[PDB]
Design an enzyme around this catalytic site. Sequence first.
Site, short mmCIF file in Angstrom:
data_model
loop_
_atom_site.label_atom_id
_atom_site.label_comp_id
_atom_site.label_asym_id
_atom_site.label_seq_id
_atom_site.Cartn_x
_atom_site.Cartn_y
_atom_site.Cartn_z
N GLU A 35 2.70 -12.81 -7.05
CA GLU A 35 1.89 -11.87 -6.28
C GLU A 35 1.29 -12.51 -5.03
O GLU A 35 1.32 -11.92 -3.95
CB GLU A 35 0.76 -11.29 -7.13
CG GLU A 35 1.21 -10.35 -8.24
CD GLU A 35 1.87 -9.07 -7.73
OE1 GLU A 35 1.87 -8.82 -6.50
OE2 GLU A 35 2.39 -8.31 -8.57
N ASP A 48 2.27 3.24 1.97
CA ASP A 48 1.39 4.41 1.87
C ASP A 48 0.02 4.23 2.52
O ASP A 48 -0.81 5.15 2.50
CB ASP A 48 1.25 4.86 0.41
CG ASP A 48 0.40 3.90 -0.44
OD1 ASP A 48 0.02 2.81 0.02
OD2 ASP A 48 0.09 4.26 -1.60
N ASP A 101 -5.09 -0.17 -18.82
CA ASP A 101 -4.93 1.20 -18.29
C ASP A 101 -3.84 1.99 -19.00
O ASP A 101 -3.79 3.22 -18.88
CB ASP A 101 -4.64 1.14 -16.78
CG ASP A 101 -4.82 2.48 -16.08
OD1 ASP A 101 -5.93 3.05 -16.13
OD2 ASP A 101 -3.85 2.94 -15.45
#
Length: 129
Positions: A35, A48, A101
């Site tokens: 990452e 986005d 989540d």
Amino acid sequence: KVFGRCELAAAMKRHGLDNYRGYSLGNWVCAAKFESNFNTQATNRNTDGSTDYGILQINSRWWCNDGRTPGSRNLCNIPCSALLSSDITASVNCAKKIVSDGNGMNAWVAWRNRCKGTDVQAWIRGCRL
């Protein structure tokens, strides 16, 4: 700041990530490697308009506030800048929410594509933990 491999493993363990939601420390270190290359100051803009921040590239679409991601949430209740600190507490705490989540570490696409199923223990090999 840019962590060493074992230095980050140790910091992650100290902050309670070792086996968090059943994900061994090597998974977390591997995810951070791909990452951010272990750089807390890493940022990357998404198509986005959202932005990913810090060692685990946490996204402003859901998790932090950066004031420039329309329609987004701030579920970790932090400014995204907190995710860039030399102190990894904010990144770790938010990562714990993310991994809880529902989809586990699949939330990190780089983990799914580069870490999942591999010999992730190699990432902590030789480290004093």
